[PDB]
């Protein structure tokens, strides 16, 4: 059953999403978005809290499904600490890449899910004994979600998320 980091993140994303229905997306973005003005640059939660916001039912639902599954597997087999660090680094780097190319109005766990996906996949490719791997069906299901977002059926920030994941799996599998 989903560990504490996996659990607290899902609930935090649920709570934030409730606040966005109640107050509108814009007002929530006003408090949680990546610093959108120099006057806000020292509000440090904002470098991470952007990940907690979602803008549609499908967004939060598919994101939490992958988080629950991949994040849950990571937390279970490799520990909460590992999940926390992957999440912090991918959230920072994807948010940074996103704001650089498209400005600070964005949100969601996509960057983080791309990290977990790259992590779980490469970890199993190079080190099965870890007990963690991305199952064939899921390599497929995941790839169809890559293609979707890729052709918009931003990409740069998802690439950034993925690199974090691949980098950590590479490190862990030495
Ligand atoms: C973020 O990319 C929003 C996106 N969520 C999603 O793509 O998650 C995944 C799944 C597999 C690999 C990487 C990322 C999304 C798009 C459309 C509808 C809901 C969510």
């Amino acid at each position: 059953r989903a560990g504490p980091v996996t659990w607290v993140m899902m609930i935090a994303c649920v709570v934030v999403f409730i606040a966005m229905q109640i107050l509108g997306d814009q007002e929530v973005m006003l408090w949680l978005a990546w610093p959108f003005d120099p006057t806000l640059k020292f509000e440090f939660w904002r470098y991470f809290t952007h990940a907690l916001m979602h803008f549609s039912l499908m967004h939060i639902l598919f994101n939490l499904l992958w988080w629950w599954y991949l994040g849950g597997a990571v937390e279970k087999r490799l520990g909460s600490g590992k999940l926390i660090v992957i999440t912090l680094i991918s959230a920072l780097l994807s948010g940074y890449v996103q704001q650089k190319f498209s400005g600070p109005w964005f949100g969601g766990l996509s960057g983080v899910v791309y990290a977990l996906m790259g992590y779980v996949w490469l970890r199993g490719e190079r080190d099965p004994q870890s007990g963690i791997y991305l199952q064939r069906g899921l390599i497929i299901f995941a790839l169809i979600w890559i293609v979707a977002g890729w052709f918009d059926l931003a990409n740069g920030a998802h690439i950034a998320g993925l690199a974090v994941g691949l980098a950590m799996a590479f490190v862990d599998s030495l």
Side-chain angles (χ1 to χ4, degrees), residues 2-128 130-174:
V5 172
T6 306
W7 172 238
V8 173
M9 168 72 87
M10 289 177 95
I11 185 87
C13 286
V14 156
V15 169
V16 169
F17 188 76
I18 288 181
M20 299 175 69
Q21 302 332 302
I22 297 180
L23 309 177
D25 297 347
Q26 301 101 332
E27 268 301 326
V28 169
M29 272 192 289
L30 204 64
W31 286 32
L32 296 179
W34 189 278
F36 44 87
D37 195 311
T39 168
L40 305 167
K41 61 188 161 152
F42 303 130
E43 295 184 350
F44 300 93
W45 62 85
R46 295 181 180 260
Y47 297 107
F48 314 84
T49 61
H50 56 87
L52 300 175
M53 289 181 294
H54 301 78
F55 306 99
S56 85
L57 286 176
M58 193 149 305
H59 195 194
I60 191 166
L61 282 168
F62 280 92
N63 278 2
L64 289 200
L65 200 62
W66 286 97
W67 169 264
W68 172 80
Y69 190 76
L70 298 175
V74 171
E75 171 160 41
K76 174 184 190 185
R77 306 171 183 278
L78 308 176
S80 297
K82 181 92 64 181
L83 184 52
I84 285 162
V85 173
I86 302 177
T87 299
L88 295 177
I89 305 179
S90 59
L92 276 166
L93 188 66
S94 62
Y96 174 82
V97 176
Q98 183 59 30
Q99 67 82 28
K100 186 61 187 187
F101 294 114
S102 307
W105 306 107
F106 65 86
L109 276 174
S110 297
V112 174
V113 168
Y114 269 94
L116 290 169
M117 200 198 75
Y119 182 91
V120 169
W121 177 74
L122 185 64
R123 190 73 204 272
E125 196 81 307
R126 295 181 41 118
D127 182 30
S130 60
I132 200 179
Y133 67 92
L134 189 54
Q135 188 170 353
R136 279 172 164 190
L138 272 161
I139 296 175
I140 299 295
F141 181 20
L143 276 172
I144 305 179
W145 272 120
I146 286 189
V147 179
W150 188 265
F151 295 94
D152 308 290
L153 308 184
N155 293 334
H158 293 158
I159 290 181
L162 185 63
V164 171
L166 298 170
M168 299 181 57
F170 176 80
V171 161
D172 289 356
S173 88
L174 301 166

